[PDB]
Amino acid sequence: GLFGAIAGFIEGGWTGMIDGWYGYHHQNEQGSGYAADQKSTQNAINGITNKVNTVIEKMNIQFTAVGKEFNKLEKRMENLNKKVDDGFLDIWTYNAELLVLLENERTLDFHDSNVKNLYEKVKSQLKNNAKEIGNGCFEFYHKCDNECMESVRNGTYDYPKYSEESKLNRE
Amino acid sequence: GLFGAIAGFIEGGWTGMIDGWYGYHHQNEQGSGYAADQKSTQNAINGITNKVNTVIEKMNIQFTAVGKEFNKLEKRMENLNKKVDDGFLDIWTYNAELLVLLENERTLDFHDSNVKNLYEKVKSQLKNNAKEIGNGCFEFYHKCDNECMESVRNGTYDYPKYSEESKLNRE
Amino acid sequence: GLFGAIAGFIEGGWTGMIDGWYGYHHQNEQGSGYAADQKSTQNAINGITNKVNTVIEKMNIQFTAVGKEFNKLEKRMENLNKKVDDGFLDIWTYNAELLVLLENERTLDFHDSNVKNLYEKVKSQLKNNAKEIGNGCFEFYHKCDNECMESVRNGTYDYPKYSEESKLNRE
Amino acid sequence: DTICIGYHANNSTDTVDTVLEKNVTVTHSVNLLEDSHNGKLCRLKGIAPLQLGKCNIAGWLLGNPECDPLLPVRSWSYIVETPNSENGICYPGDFIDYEELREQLSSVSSFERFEIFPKESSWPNHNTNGVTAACSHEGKSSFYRNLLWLTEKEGSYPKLKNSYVNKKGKEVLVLWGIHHPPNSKEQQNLYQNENAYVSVVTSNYNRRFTPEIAERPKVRDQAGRMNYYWTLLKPGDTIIFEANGNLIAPMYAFALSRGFGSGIITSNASMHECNTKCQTPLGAINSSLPYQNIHPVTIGECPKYVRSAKLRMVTGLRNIPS
Amino acid sequence: DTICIGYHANNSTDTVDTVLEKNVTVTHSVNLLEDSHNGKLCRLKGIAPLQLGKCNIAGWLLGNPECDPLLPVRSWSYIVETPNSENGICYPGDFIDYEELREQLSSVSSFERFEIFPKESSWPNHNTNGVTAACSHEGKSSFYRNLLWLTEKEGSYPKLKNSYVNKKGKEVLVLWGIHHPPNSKEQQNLYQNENAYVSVVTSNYNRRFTPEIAERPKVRDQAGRMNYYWTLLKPGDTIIFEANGNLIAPMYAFALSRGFGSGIITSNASMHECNTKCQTPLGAINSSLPYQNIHPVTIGECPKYVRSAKLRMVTGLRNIPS
Amino acid sequence: DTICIGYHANNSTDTVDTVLEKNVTVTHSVNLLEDSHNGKLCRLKGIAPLQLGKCNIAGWLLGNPECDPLLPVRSWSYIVETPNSENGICYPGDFIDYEELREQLSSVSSFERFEIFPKESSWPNHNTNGVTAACSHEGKSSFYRNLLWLTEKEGSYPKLKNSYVNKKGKEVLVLWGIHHPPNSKEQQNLYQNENAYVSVVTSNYNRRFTPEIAERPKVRDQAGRMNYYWTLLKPGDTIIFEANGNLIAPMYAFALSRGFGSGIITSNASMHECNTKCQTPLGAINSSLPYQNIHPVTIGECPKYVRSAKLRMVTGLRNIPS
Amino acid sequence: XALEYFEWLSA
Amino acid sequence: XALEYFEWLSA
Amino acid sequence: XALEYFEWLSA
């Protein structure tokens, strides 16, 4: 990717997570599991939806366009009509293909961006109360049940609450 | 944003700062205030100016173009002329709208980029002599008057000068 | 740049490195030297090659297209033919110039991205066993011969191997 | 205790191209290019097309006998000509401004066929029984259904002058013909005047026709020629025919109504009991996609035709099941 | 002690669309789409347009009496026709190659009206007093100002042959007419020769005209017709008229000068004392913007016309007063 | 001990433009715009062009004597006309449907010149020796090489009727002419019939020509005119000429073969012993680039013409030797 | 059109 | 054109 | 075409 996230320091995706585009995998004493971040996912969905809708809307309805006929003494007009049709065709194929390419690139990089942004948000939430063990995973300096994990997921982690215990286990 | 800065970890903008696009807000014993970073701002201004100038220049002057007339036995030529005009119109509307969309997106992401870059530059300047308290703000491990803040603004912070005191207050 | 790397916190490039686009400069007891990262370089080469190949392929071969002639009573058809030719010309010049501009921007930002990504990968490899001295350079908390540098280059650094010595020199 | 940030993956094998990389597998994608049609000629917005069958436009308008006669009144959404029309102009000659007449027909949505100059009743003292083998039907020599070959009656061809007043409240397509014998012998035998002329006038139409006698290469076993002419008679206006020979008089004419989004296409497919909003010579398109690679020729509300074979836009992420 | 990095915000309510998100509020933006005009016909680069008023091009060139006579010499930047021109061809007939003549006029920047064949002086032994009610003016029957109806004089129409040599140093537009009586009676009464002909020749122009007599549907109370012809007489060249009847002779002709960036438009607006570099049928555009949605028809140096209603480009940031 | 991550730099002075910044120096870049040609007329895919030299298309087809005679059989890839062709229509008049004939020639790849109506052998009882000073060659009065001026023989011009059957297996371009004397005196002196006519017919061609006598402005010292006509005689078809005067008969005709990717260009350059896949009026292009700014007029497989002066795409990085 | 890739998404 | 959004900007 | 900027690159 462009932001180095997808197929980067997070080499693979989670087929186990089938309810979101981005998300989390928690592992504690109560068990382990996947859970999507609905905010950024809904955001991405909205953005890309508007993108596709745009590309579709920018193409006006192509109304009736039929060929004409010409006699043996109107070869020039015939050739001109052909040149017009062919030119317009060239241009529109060009535009379509190019647009799709550019938009695809931008989309991929957009997803990369969102993933990295999520990672950075979580990281800034946790600070030095955990350590980055690579692969986009954090290891806690303390115990964390399902309620704690939930507090992290929906953007409400409490740093002073675990700062002391984490400071202890950090040594 | 794409770089997660604007409307990200810096949720809002400063209406108090009316002399720049990006900038600073300092708070110390001598008082508090806003002050723009003229370098990156001038850079952004130049870039975007060149962008707009480009979009304007790429459109050649549309010279005189009037409709023609045709008699009752020249319906084919009339229809062809109409097809030409309409086709060109379609294409140009398409191009204009698309171009403006793409450029707007790229511009927003550009500003995001500049803000995050400024933040990273400041952060790399300060290192461990201060702590990131979120919202794109740093808290000093020492005293800093207006001259110090100015030394930070124009990219000339002195790390060994405050490393000891900061190391003390860090404990 | 957009990612703040090239002409950013790495102000200049290395003319001494002539065997790659991105790379390294190692400095130890055995000596100093440059060495390119072949992975990301090959990747960039492939991507940009495919980009150029695309831009070339999207332009179909312009086959035979000659002017026509018209008598003094066919001024309208003459003018129409001229309008068609000129319109198509306008459109194609517009498209060419625009495409080249956009692609150039995207390319520059792509290189920026790759450089920063390499830097981040190395940084995440080293962790706290070294310190960031700016200019995209790291200073070791331990001794490192050519074999160690090679272990860093091809993405196989050993953190627990030097964690103790680094922890000592860190104090 | 650990927590991880990751992204979606699934069994999608969808592939998309980018500027940097071709053939990227992704989790979600949409296809913008319609490539499917039903191979059927269909109704367009509830209105059936006008199929000419064995006839082409000329053969239909002139009234070629080898084609099965249509209803006196028809409405359509588009006109269909078969590629292999052996039935058209059956008596050799030139259909003047034929293509322009086709272009006129491209915006016609309805016709009423009606008898403008009744057979025995409009041309007294002239024979109206002339036929030819070039216009054969069921073996017997015949002639165009909408035209009438006026010949000499009892050794004389009196100067005829008849007129029609358009009280149909619509444009009326009127067609007529000029016969050109190969020699002055046949000229005298058919029209008794070596210096004949035909005159057709309206408020805005004004044309005079003169026979051109010369031996010509046989075409459909005919050394003679026949030029076909037409005009659109505006509502309320009058057309006047005045000739002393060589006139192939109008018998039937067409009341025309104008419409939108119609056209003429050449197609092999057959009419089926179906309805569509987009029709191509290959079949109907039922799609909301912006692009199509089925055919450049379209009737109705269709996607823009392109030469592309693939236009797939990625919505999901790069799919990595690793 | 603390320091913070942040970005600009203000009371801007400017909205822009992106590919990902519609209607984004931003701090700074430019409008690239001109949508404002002054509703006035203006001078283009200091040069006033040529307004024809009650006349259209044909009515002007032929010299229709119901239109107020222009100056003998005029220069313009563009020609303006009113939508409701009841004054044009006042004697029924066809203006041959009319549209082509308009196209020629689209690149003409100046005309000098001059008497090519003086009334009483060029056609001896012919009557030059003919008029008609189809070309009425102030109640009385009249005729085209630039043409002359030559009729029989004293029971005879001698073969006339006159010529003009173009010593103007510019192209000269010459117009003439051919009269077509409804019957041979009026033919004899007007030109005394049932087999008349008109001949017009130049170095590159060569045409012969023959009267076509037939009763026609009345148009503007006339069963007769009149065909109008024109030609561009090159500098130094000679035009020769040679006729024995049915000629509507030229009296006035036009010396033409060629220019650039001119054209013909149909407009309702009135001329005002103003100047512009871009003119539309709706009014003048004063703008440096690349796009406009005012009108597709333009004269001068104008922005490219588009169908868009909004083309706003963002320069500032996403505005968040929070 | 230290390690550093950095990027490439070199002595490249290549400059590229972006949307944000103009004139950026970079390490690697490709040029997509071809601006170089060899200033030579070359063979296209191994096939040499057809150079007309002093002649234009008309002068060649009619067979103007001032131009050096070509081989009876030629094949080409494109036709070249010189800008300064003083040799074309040497006897004043109109080449009817000339431009259309050029357009036909644009898809012709080969011609065989052959004698369709042999000089002394096809027109008995007619003089075939007529010449003129308008068609001079080496001082002496002459005439078109491919046409024959039939005049009266022994005070009489018998009605001629000759025909040719196309057994060439290819389309045959046949050209002929109609002479128009300035007065009835010369008319009688040349063709002995004041009421003459020419008749040309094929299976699909059918035209009658009548002399138009009037004094005309001298052009190339001629008060008379000559109209030139042509037709494409389909394989197996027959053309019949039947005239009693004023016919400029065909002597030579052309068997034509059709091809692809040909055309007519106007060029100054000279033929050299070279080969190319793309030809412009300025010279040949040897390039694999998608764009070119050399010329809009192209023959063969060429890059798309643009108005740009620079289309450089960056592949390397921003070059900073600092 | 709607991108119904997940069920909780809003329509 | 110039983007005069701030006064210190250069023209 | 190939971008031969470096020799080890593959073709």
Ligand SMILES: *[C@@H]1O[C@H](CO)[C@@H](O[C@@H]2O[C@H](CO)[C@@H](O)[C@H](O)[C@H]2NC(C)=O)[C@H](O)[C@H]1NC(C)=O
């Ligand atoms: C976000 O997470 C916080 C922590 O889990 C949630 O706080 C819990 O909310 C429930 C309501 O179902 C309360 O009954 C629990 O007692 C709360 N836990 C705590 C820490 O008291 C919060 O509800 C979640 N929702 C949002 C949108 O913040």
Ligand SMILES: *[C@@H]1O[C@H](CO)[C@@H](O[C@@H]2O[C@H](CO)[C@@H](O)[C@H](O)[C@H]2NC(C)=O)[C@H](O)[C@H]1NC(C)=O
């Ligand atoms: C950048 O900031 C440094 C620190 O404020 C400035 O250094 C001061 O410059 C003034 C000149 O007005 C001197 O008189 C002060 O004594 C300097 N302070 C120090 C630390 O000595 C510097 O001038 C600023 N300008 C630039 C462009 O660096």
Ligand SMILES: *[C@@H]1O[C@H](CO)[C@@H](O[C@@H]2O[C@H](CO)[C@@H](O)[C@H](O)[C@H]2NC(C)=O)[C@H](O)[C@H]1NC(C)=O
């Ligand atoms: C990457 O670097 C590691 C460390 O230098 C390399 O490991 C060495 O490989 C050589 C083979 O030439 C062995 O003989 C050395 O003994 C290895 N060193 C160690 C640490 O044992 C490795 O070969 C390199 N290559 C790749 C692709 O990883």
Ligand SMILES: *[C@@H]1O[C@H](CO)[C@@H](O[C@@H]2O[C@H](CO)[C@@H](O)[C@H](O)[C@H]2NC(C)=O)[C@H](O)[C@H]1NC(C)=O
């Ligand atoms: C396009 O991508 C597809 C999908 O990866 C490639 O098809 C793979 O083809 C290989 C060779 O046959 C098979 O081993 C894989 O199993 C296929 N993958 C799937 C999921 O079907 C294909 O090779 C690519 N084409 C090009 C030219 O890039």
Ligand SMILES: *[C@@H]1O[C@H](CO)[C@@H](O[C@@H]2O[C@H](CO)[C@@H](O)[C@H](O)[C@H]2NC(C)=O)[C@H](O)[C@H]1NC(C)=O
């Ligand atoms: C486009 O954005 C404007 C600006 O935010 C929206 O207008 C707001 O409209 C709401 C509903 O009337 C008002 O409460 C706000 O006060 C308006 N804002 C301003 C600053 O005027 C508008 O709703 C948006 N339109 C669409 C369709 O997205």
Ligand SMILES: *[C@@H]1O[C@H](CO)[C@@H](O[C@@H]2O[C@H](CO)[C@@H](O)[C@H](O)[C@H]2NC(C)=O)[C@H](O)[C@H]1NC(C)=O
């Ligand atoms: C485009 O960039 C080139 C390359 O930097 C500029 O040329 C430089 O020109 C200056 C002034 O003459 C010289 O001092 C430098 O030595 C040139 N550089 C090189 C490497 O040749 C040029 O000025 C730029 N043009 C514009 C208008 O931006």
Ligand SMILES: *[C@@H]1O[C@H](CO)[C@@H](O)[C@H](O)[C@H]1NC(C)=O
């Ligand atoms: C993908 O897997 C789903 C089951 O979740 C199955 O229904 C579908 O057919 C599969 N599609 C492909 C293309 O493998």
Ligand SMILES: *[C@@H]1O[C@H](CO)[C@@H](O)[C@H](O)[C@H]1NC(C)=O
């Ligand atoms: C329909 O016509 C096409 C030619 O356009 C021909 O290839 C095809 O065989 C025909 N098919 C049928 C079913 O008639």
Ligand SMILES: *[C@@H]1O[C@H](CO)[C@@H](O)[C@H](O)[C@H]1NC(C)=O
């Ligand atoms: C056209 O496609 C839509 C989408 O499935 C479907 O609802 C509709 O039934 C189709 N119409 C016909 C007539 O096939």
Ligand SMILES: *[C@@H]1O[C@H](CO)[C@@H](O)[C@H](O)[C@H]1NC(C)=O
């Ligand atoms: C914005 O505020 C300024 C005062 O700084 C005022 O002059 C201007 O009218 C305001 N514009 C809008 C659109 O609110």
Ligand SMILES: *[C@@H]1O[C@H](CO)[C@@H](O)[C@H](O)[C@H]1NC(C)=O
């Ligand atoms: C101008 O003409 C238009 C028709 O084009 C008509 O709608 C409008 O009423 C007219 N306005 C004036 C002021 O004459």
Ligand SMILES: *[C@@H]1O[C@H](CO)[C@@H](O)[C@H](O)[C@H]1NC(C)=O
């Ligand atoms: C056109 O607009 C410019 C920009 O304000 C102004 O300077 C000029 O006066 C205007 N010209 C006229 C004639 O209105």
Ligand SMILES: *[C@@H]1O[C@H](CO)[C@@H](O)[C@H](O)[C@H]1NC(C)=O
């Ligand atoms: C760049 O330097 C190389 C030597 O490595 C030299 O061969 C080449 O000519 C130089 N090119 C330019 C443009 O300076």
Ligand SMILES: *[C@@H]1O[C@H](CO)[C@@H](O)[C@H](O)[C@H]1NC(C)=O
């Ligand atoms: C070729 O012709 C051009 C005009 O098109 C003229 O400018 C040039 O002088 C000529 N050059 C030669 C060598 O004949």
Ligand SMILES: *[C@@H]1O[C@H](CO)[C@@H](O)[C@H](O)[C@H]1NC(C)=O
């Ligand atoms: C055309 O250019 C290619 C690229 O150098 C070269 O190989 C070839 O020889 C050139 N052909 C001619 C005929 O000049």
